[PDB]
Coordinates of C-alpha atoms in Angstrom, one line a residue:
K1 CA 0.0 0.0 0.0
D2 CA 1.5 3.3 -1.2
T3 CA 1.3 6.4 0.9
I4 CA 0.4 10.0 -0.1
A5 CA 1.1 12.7 2.5
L6 CA -1.0 15.8 3.2
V7 CA 0.5 18.7 5.1
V8 CA -2.5 20.9 5.9
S9 CA -2.2 24.5 7.1
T10 CA -4.6 24.0 10.0
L11 CA -7.5 21.7 11.2
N12 CA -8.9 24.6 13.2
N13 CA -11.1 25.8 10.3
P14 CA -14.0 23.9 8.7
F15 CA -12.7 24.8 5.2
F16 CA -9.5 22.9 5.8
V17 CA -11.2 20.0 7.6
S18 CA -13.3 19.6 4.4
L19 CA -10.1 19.8 2.4
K20 CA -8.7 17.0 4.5
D21 CA -11.9 14.9 4.3
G22 CA -12.1 15.3 0.5
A23 CA -8.5 14.1 0.2
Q24 CA -9.1 11.2 2.6
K25 CA -12.2 9.9 0.6
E26 CA -10.4 10.2 -2.7
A27 CA -7.3 8.5 -1.4
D28 CA -9.4 5.6 0.0
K29 CA -11.1 5.4 -3.4
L30 CA -7.8 5.3 -5.3
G31 CA -6.3 2.8 -2.9
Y32 CA -3.8 4.9 -1.0
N33 CA -2.8 5.4 2.6
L34 CA -3.1 9.2 3.4
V35 CA -0.8 10.5 6.1
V36 CA -2.2 13.8 7.4
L37 CA 0.0 16.4 9.2
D38 CA -1.4 19.5 10.8
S39 CA 0.8 22.7 10.7
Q40 CA -1.4 24.5 13.2
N41 CA -1.0 27.7 11.0
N42 CA 2.7 27.9 11.9
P43 CA 5.4 27.9 9.2
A44 CA 7.9 26.4 11.6
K45 CA 5.6 23.4 12.3
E46 CA 4.9 23.1 8.6
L47 CA 8.6 23.1 7.9
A48 CA 9.0 20.3 10.6
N49 CA 6.2 18.3 9.1
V50 CA 7.8 18.3 5.6
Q51 CA 11.2 17.3 7.1
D52 CA 9.6 14.4 9.0
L53 CA 7.9 13.3 5.7
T54 CA 11.1 13.5 3.7
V55 CA 13.1 11.1 5.9
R56 CA 10.1 8.7 5.9
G57 CA 10.3 8.3 2.1
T58 CA 6.9 9.7 1.1
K59 CA 6.1 9.2 -2.6
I60 CA 4.3 12.5 -3.2
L61 CA 3.8 15.6 -1.0
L62 CA 0.4 17.4 -1.1
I63 CA 1.0 20.7 0.8
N64 CA -1.5 23.4 1.7
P65 CA 0.8 26.2 2.6
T66 CA 0.2 28.3 5.7
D67 CA 1.6 31.2 3.7
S68 CA 2.7 31.4 0.1
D69 CA 6.0 33.2 0.9
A70 CA 6.9 31.2 4.0
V71 CA 6.5 27.8 2.5
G72 CA 9.5 28.3 0.1
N73 CA 12.0 26.4 2.2
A74 CA 9.6 23.6 3.0
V75 CA 9.1 23.0 -0.7
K76 CA 12.9 23.1 -1.2
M77 CA 13.5 20.3 1.3
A78 CA 11.0 18.2 -0.8
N79 CA 12.6 19.3 -4.1
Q80 CA 16.0 18.2 -2.9
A81 CA 14.7 14.9 -1.6
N82 CA 13.0 14.4 -5.0
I83 CA 9.5 14.2 -3.6
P84 CA 7.0 15.7 -6.1
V85 CA 5.1 18.6 -4.6
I86 CA 1.5 19.5 -5.3
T87 CA 0.1 22.7 -3.7
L88 CA -3.4 23.1 -2.5
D89 CA -5.4 26.4 -2.1
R90 CA -2.3 28.6 -1.7
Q91 CA 0.6 28.7 -4.3
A92 CA 4.2 28.4 -3.2
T93 CA 6.2 31.5 -4.2
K94 CA 9.5 29.7 -4.4
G95 CA 10.3 26.0 -5.0
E96 CA 9.5 23.6 -7.8
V97 CA 5.8 22.5 -7.7
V98 CA 4.4 19.9 -10.1
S99 CA 0.8 21.1 -10.0
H100 CA -1.3 23.6 -8.1
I101 CA -4.9 22.9 -7.2
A102 CA -7.2 25.8 -6.0
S103 CA -10.6 27.1 -6.6
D104 CA -11.5 28.6 -10.0
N105 CA -11.5 32.2 -8.7
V106 CA -11.7 33.4 -12.3
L107 CA -15.0 31.4 -12.9
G108 CA -16.1 32.6 -9.4
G109 CA -15.8 36.2 -10.4
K110 CA -17.4 35.7 -13.8
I111 CA -20.3 33.8 -12.0
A112 CA -20.8 36.7 -9.6
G113 CA -20.9 39.2 -12.5
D114 CA -23.3 37.0 -14.5
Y115 CA -25.7 37.0 -11.6
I116 CA -25.5 40.8 -11.3
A117 CA -26.4 41.0 -15.0
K118 CA -29.3 38.6 -14.4
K119 CA -30.8 40.8 -11.6
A120 CA -29.5 44.4 -12.4
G121 CA -29.6 44.0 -16.1
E122 CA -27.1 44.3 -19.0
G123 CA -25.1 47.5 -18.9
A124 CA -25.6 47.9 -15.1
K125 CA -23.6 50.5 -13.2
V126 CA -21.5 48.5 -10.7
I127 CA -18.9 49.0 -8.0
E128 CA -16.2 46.4 -7.2
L129 CA -14.5 45.9 -3.8
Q130 CA -11.2 44.2 -4.3
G131 CA -9.2 42.1 -1.9
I132 CA -5.6 42.6 -0.8
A133 CA -3.5 43.9 -3.7
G134 CA -0.9 41.4 -4.8
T135 CA -2.7 38.2 -3.6
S136 CA -3.7 35.6 -6.2
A137 CA -7.4 35.5 -5.0
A138 CA -7.9 39.3 -5.6
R139 CA -6.2 39.0 -9.0
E140 CA -8.1 36.0 -10.3
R141 CA -11.5 37.1 -8.9
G142 CA -10.8 40.5 -10.5
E143 CA -10.1 39.1 -14.0
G144 CA -13.2 36.8 -13.7
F145 CA -15.3 39.8 -12.9
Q146 CA -13.8 41.7 -15.8
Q147 CA -15.0 38.8 -18.1
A148 CA -18.5 39.5 -16.9
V149 CA -17.9 43.3 -17.2
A150 CA -17.1 42.8 -20.9
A151 CA -19.8 40.2 -21.7
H152 CA -22.6 42.1 -19.9
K153 CA -21.3 45.6 -20.8
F154 CA -21.0 46.7 -17.1
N155 CA -20.1 50.3 -16.3
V156 CA -17.7 50.0 -13.3
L157 CA -18.2 53.2 -11.5
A158 CA -15.4 52.4 -9.0
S159 CA -13.0 49.5 -8.3
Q160 CA -11.0 49.8 -5.1
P161 CA -9.3 47.5 -2.5
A162 CA -10.9 46.9 0.9
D163 CA -8.3 44.3 1.7
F164 CA -10.7 41.4 2.4
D165 CA -11.8 43.2 5.6
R166 CA -15.2 44.0 6.9
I167 CA -14.3 47.3 8.5
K168 CA -12.4 48.5 5.4
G169 CA -15.2 47.1 3.2
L170 CA -17.7 49.3 5.2
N171 CA -15.5 52.4 5.1
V172 CA -14.6 52.1 1.4
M173 CA -18.2 51.4 0.4
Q174 CA -19.3 54.4 2.4
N175 CA -16.8 56.6 0.5
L176 CA -17.7 55.2 -2.9
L177 CA -21.4 55.4 -2.2
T178 CA -21.4 59.2 -1.6
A179 CA -19.1 59.6 -4.7
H180 CA -21.2 57.3 -6.9
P181 CA -24.8 57.3 -5.7
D182 CA -26.1 55.8 -9.0
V183 CA -24.5 52.4 -8.3
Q184 CA -26.9 49.5 -9.0
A185 CA -24.8 46.6 -7.8
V186 CA -21.7 45.7 -5.9
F187 CA -19.3 42.8 -6.3
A188 CA -17.1 42.2 -3.2
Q189 CA -14.2 39.7 -3.5
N190 CA -15.0 38.1 -0.1
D191 CA -18.0 37.9 2.2
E192 CA -16.3 40.1 4.9
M193 CA -16.1 43.0 2.4
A194 CA -19.6 42.2 1.1
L195 CA -21.0 42.3 4.7
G196 CA -19.1 45.5 5.4
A197 CA -20.5 47.0 2.2
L198 CA -24.0 45.8 3.2
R199 CA -23.7 47.6 6.5
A200 CA -22.6 50.8 4.7
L201 CA -25.6 50.6 2.3
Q202 CA -28.0 49.9 5.1
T203 CA -26.8 53.0 7.0
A204 CA -27.3 55.2 3.9
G205 CA -30.8 53.8 3.2
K206 CA -29.7 51.9 0.1
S207 CA -30.6 48.2 0.5
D208 CA -32.0 48.2 -3.1
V209 CA -28.4 48.0 -4.4
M210 CA -27.6 44.3 -4.7
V211 CA -24.4 43.0 -3.1
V212 CA -22.7 39.8 -4.3
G213 CA -20.0 38.3 -2.0
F214 CA -17.5 35.4 -2.4
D215 CA -16.3 32.5 -0.2
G216 CA -19.5 31.0 1.1
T217 CA -18.7 31.6 4.8
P218 CA -21.1 31.0 7.6
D219 CA -21.8 34.7 8.0
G220 CA -22.0 35.2 4.2
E221 CA -24.4 32.3 3.6
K222 CA -26.5 33.4 6.7
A223 CA -26.8 36.8 5.1
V224 CA -28.1 35.3 1.9
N225 CA -30.7 33.2 3.7
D226 CA -31.9 36.4 5.5
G227 CA -32.5 38.2 2.2
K228 CA -29.7 40.7 3.0
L229 CA -26.9 39.5 0.7
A230 CA -28.1 38.9 -2.9
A231 CA -25.6 36.0 -3.3
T232 CA -22.2 34.5 -2.6
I233 CA -19.8 32.1 -4.3
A234 CA -19.1 29.0 -2.2
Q235 CA -15.9 27.1 -2.7
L236 CA -15.6 23.4 -2.6
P237 CA -12.7 22.6 -0.3
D238 CA -13.4 18.9 -0.3
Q239 CA -13.0 18.9 -4.1
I240 CA -9.6 20.7 -3.8
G241 CA -8.4 17.9 -1.5
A242 CA -9.9 15.2 -3.8
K243 CA -8.4 16.7 -7.0
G244 CA -5.1 17.0 -5.2
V245 CA -5.0 13.3 -4.3
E246 CA -6.1 12.3 -7.8
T247 CA -3.4 14.5 -9.4
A248 CA -0.8 12.9 -7.0
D249 CA -2.1 9.6 -8.3
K250 CA -1.6 10.6 -12.0
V251 CA 1.9 11.7 -11.1
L252 CA 2.6 8.3 -9.5
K253 CA 1.3 6.5 -12.5
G254 CA 4.0 8.1 -14.7
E255 CA 1.6 10.7 -16.2
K256 CA 2.4 14.4 -17.0
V257 CA -0.1 16.7 -15.2
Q258 CA -1.3 20.2 -16.0
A259 CA 0.2 23.0 -14.0
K260 CA -3.2 24.0 -12.6
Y261 CA -6.5 22.3 -12.1
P262 CA -9.0 25.0 -11.1
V263 CA -11.8 23.5 -8.9
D264 CA -15.4 24.3 -9.6
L265 CA -17.5 26.5 -7.3
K266 CA -21.2 27.2 -6.8
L267 CA -23.5 30.2 -6.8
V268 CA -25.4 30.5 -3.5
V269 CA -28.7 32.3 -3.7
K270 CA -31.7 32.4 -1.4
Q271 CA -33.5 29.0 -1.8

């Protein structure tokens, strides 16, 4: 029985427990023994986990980095030991990686935009609240939304960062609202920003302006069920873990794998 190892950023969040669960079910299904190591959101422990795995002759390393920049050296221990590395959710800035499996953030953003078109109409006047500048999530969600901006002929009144934060989402939306009162819809690159933006619009007496979030968090999905948030984009973390294990399998069977395998996601609306 061959062993596939999974170094997970943390098991303290439901998102990553699903990622582990999806990886476990797929591994069982493909006939592998999955060794799971928790990094406890600490790069030093992640580094120790990868070193432990190298000396125990692991065939492939599935690693969900605690941080893209900090994982560099952990990937390098695996690279030198000749253990193929596959990243999950977060990319590794440095180090040789055979494949990266994450959500299809581009499709996510396009989905959000298509929904805005469905409810606000073609050529709608929209505002976009971006995530932290430089992060891959903000970049990919942004280009996905731009695909919907082109296809649906959206007029983007404003597009500014709110750094994936609820308080900044609130304050930025407040500023943009007064400067662009003709806004018909908002696309926030995470539920925190969307909720922040919702709070801002509620305070100005503008709950007729639809807000679309992203992430499918407990708070985000709750807001959709209450009829506050028009929608959210839920990720499928279990599918990231499953696809990662399957890609490891293809690598172990002597196959050449794609660099990326963007995982599908779903539009969450009321009902």
